[PDB]
Design a protein around this ligand. Structure first.
Ligand SMILES: CC(C)(COP(=O)(O)OP(=O)(O)OC[C@H]1O[C@@H](n2cnc3c(N)ncnc32)[C@H](O)[C@@H]1OP(=O)(O)O)[C@@H](O)C(=O)NCCC(=O)NCCS
Ligand SMILES: CC(C)(COP(=O)(O)OP(=O)(O)OC[C@H]1O[C@@H](n2cnc3c(N)ncnc32)[C@H](O)[C@@H]1OP(=O)(O)O)[C@@H](O)C(=O)NCCC(=O)NCCS
Ligand SMILES: O=C1C[C@@H](c2ccccc2)Oc2cc(O)cc(O)c21
Ligand SMILES: O=C1C[C@@H](c2ccccc2)Oc2cc(O)cc(O)c21
Lengths: 390, 390
């Protein structure tokens, strides 16, 4: 007879909303723009290198808070190593919760229930820190009840989409009637800086990173015919990959957030992911019983840290060429939105499945994988179940 | 049949370790020390106001990472408003997880099981941010399994001790066999700065804030005659207090972490806490059945934001004067250690109960309250149950 009753069924995604800044930057135009606005067009070697990163980035466009106008008004962001944290913070402490509020309103509207049924909130970002935090600012913007149980996950990085689901699963499953608002909001004004020929990992981030926020309603036991489940969370795992110490570092310095990235990240991920997944699926489908579905029969929501990561994972695991299609669509249209990205991909996948009348929310497959990769090198693994359609 | 099995009994504290820097700073000595090492002794009126805050702080001693030698070596910490974040970060990014490791090892030794049985980690701090985070640095220092499920709660503030329990409860209860390492580690090198007569709320921080780390092993279903429970978590609540907007703010700026404290913080807390506790207790002990214990028959683990908070809460709720004794002993010998403090108090309470042979780990009372207060103004409430002794 618990003092807090728990729930029975699996934690379920009941709604997804997304939001991007309205300023669209087409990748074809970005090297000219990026090197002009940072007064670096004379470094023609650096620029050619940046052109080829952009050429191969498999990003067609990104949505960016930073405009030409904001940049020319704030010269310290356009240089490479100028003190700038205070200005960066003044921006993202406001704009990260605001972008997340746009995404949350769309999730709440789809869900169909008054916002006061939201009992828990998880706010995740890599863009700025403050007290009270982005979670508090978001609850204020939305008018959530004063007793919402909040949690702010700061300085996470690109694995954070997996992390928020790992935690939300337990909040929803162990609290009867709990409805968890889950927000990932990322804005690149925290990292944007000029180019330097000695910091070529930061140049990569300028080719790939973009802005966005996504929002879920996560809860167990959806009310039949009133609430709608779209995916279920069944198994989570977290791994620090071997021999990955310092593969991806990020430091919050007086020049803003600095990004450090080793060239063997794709090899480290692609060469270890198979064991991680094979173990995950063995836990979920033990013999004592159906064997795990094959990789080609699972749906795939993979953090697209970069095209080389996706290509090398696809190659090492022998995935048919269409398995990463939803993943690659989101990267093409929004770039790498750090922790938010996987949820755009989740939303992209379910929307396509409805549109093309596939049999389930997961492109017609029953089971699936959501993977996030970030500093650690940390790999978050969430085994998902789709929900049948019509 | 769940793909991840859950646990049955209440999340229980199975061990507690604590760790403080070796440098002890007697409050009698502190005004002379602080104004001397910050070259402010000419500020006669400022210093006397600071003497009065110390005289009254009900803090006798604090443990501090910063020493006179370190301060004289790094003059930007002794000025009031100098660029210093990179220096501070370089310190606490290392020292915060290092201090958390001493407390963790002590908790693990007490618990008695091999460190590899730790499945989950929650690291809470208000001092510094990094990627990978302090959670990852701690796991590395300890040699935890590569698949430990980690969470870093950055920039929490003084309510963090309640927040970690609220989260560890669900991690422990929803995952069969899960053992959660909970660490709160706080080091004032991130905020320490010289005095100024235009920023006197920050002066208050100089009178009250100390350094410390505490660590818990939290798990459901302790193995009988093998593991030992000291407190059980049964009910959690979180609240933004009314008309408290901006009462407690902190920003990570290029001069380091900055502290803003309104003078009505004790009024805000003491005038609203009764309704919060009455609501909580009504939820835990509903009529439909025993009534809730009186405040005086509860044990009290209260974050000592300062003596005026404790005194006004004690006055508003009509608490017998012995109720906040364990709480006040920790403030006296350690200061306000932000998120770590309530766990020192919890450690103090169980150690006294055992030493004096009371009937339970909660000073002879069955039920109790842990409260944390911080930015928001956020109130975290955890209804605890004690365990009977011998
Ligand atoms: C876009 C790159 C980004 C794709 O391009 P590619 O297929 O490697 O194309 P190329 O091999 O021509 O590489 C182009 C340039 O990128 C540079 N580059 C790639 N990765 C780099 C890194 N981590 N640091 C510095 N420079 C790098 C290369 O040195 C090369 O320069 P060069 O033309 O002067 O040799 C690709 O390497 C990738 O997808 N990387 C993954 C991103 C990642 O590391 N993790 C994301 C984490 S959250
Ligand atoms: C130690 C102070 C810290 C206790 O002192 P006190 O008993 O109120 O003593 P006094 O009222 O004489 O105050 C002493 C001085 O502190 C000053 N002071 C107290 N709180 C202050 C604040 N938040 N900002 C600025 N000054 C403050 C008073 O104005 C007074 O100055 P004066 O002597 O020049 O008039 C007390 O106000 C307290 O405990 N407050 C709680 C601190 C807090 O907010 N903690 C929760 C935290 S994040
Ligand atoms: O350098 C930062 C940038 C940040 C981001 C991306 C997009 C939008 C806003 C912020 O994402 C990261 C993820 C990492 O795993 C490591 C990082 O060092 C970063
Ligand atoms: O300014 C910081 C200081 C930090 C701390 C305290 C002790 C040791 C290390 C760090 O605690 C805080 C708590 C708050 O509720 C608000 C704050 O602004 C702070």
């Amino acid at each position: 007879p618990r003092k807090m009753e728990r729930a029975e069924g699996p934690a379920s995604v009941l709604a997804i909303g997304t939001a991007v800044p309205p300023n669209v930057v087409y990748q074809k135009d970005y090297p000219d723009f990026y090197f002009g606005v940072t007064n670096s067009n004379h470094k023609t070697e650096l620029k050619d290198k940046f052109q080829r990163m952009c050429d191969k980035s498999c990003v067609s466009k990104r949505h960016l808070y930073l405009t030409e106008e904001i940049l020319k008004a704030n010269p310290s962001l356009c240089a490479y190593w100028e003190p700038s944290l205070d200005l960066r913070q003044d921006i993202v402490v406001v704009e990260v919760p605001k972008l997340g509020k746009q995404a949350a309103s769309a999730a709440i509207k789809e869900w169909g229930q008054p916002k006061s049924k939201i009992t828990h909130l998880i706010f995740c970002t890599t863009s700025g820190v403050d007290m009270p935090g982005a979670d508090w600012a978001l609850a204020k913007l939305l008018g959530l009840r004063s007793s919402v149980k909040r949690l702010v996950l700061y300085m996470q990085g690109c694995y954070g989409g997996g992390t928020v689901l790992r935690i939300a699963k337990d909040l929803a499953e162990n609290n009867k009637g709990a409805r968890v608002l889950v927000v990932c909001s990322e804005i690149t004004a925290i990292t944007f800086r000029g180019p330097s020929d000695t910091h070529l990992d930061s140049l990569v981030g300028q080719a790939l990173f973009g802005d966005g926020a996504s929002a879920l309603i996560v809860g167990s036991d959806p009310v039949p015919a009133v609430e709608r489940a779209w995916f279920e969370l069944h198994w989570t795992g977290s791994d620090i990959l071997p021999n990955s110490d310092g593969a991806i570092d990020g430091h919050l310095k007086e020049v803003g957030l600095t990004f450090h990235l080793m060239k063997d990240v794709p090899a480290i991920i692609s060469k270890n992911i198979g064991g991680i997944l094979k173990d995950a699926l063995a836990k979920v489908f033990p013999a004592a019983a159906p064997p795990p579905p094959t990789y080609n029969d699972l749906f795939w929501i993979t953090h697209p840290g970069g095209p080389a990561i996706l290509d090398q994972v696809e190659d090492r695991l022998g995935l048919r060429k269409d398995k990463l299609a939803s993943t690659r669509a989101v990267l093409d249209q929004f770039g790498n939105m750090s922790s938010a990205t996987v949820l755009f991909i989740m939303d992209e996948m379910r929307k396509r499945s409805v549109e093309q009348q596939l049999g389930t929310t997961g492109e017609g497959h029953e089971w699936g994988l959501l993977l996030g990769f970030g500093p650690g090198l940390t790999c978050e693994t969430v085994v998902l179940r789709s929900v049948p359609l019509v």
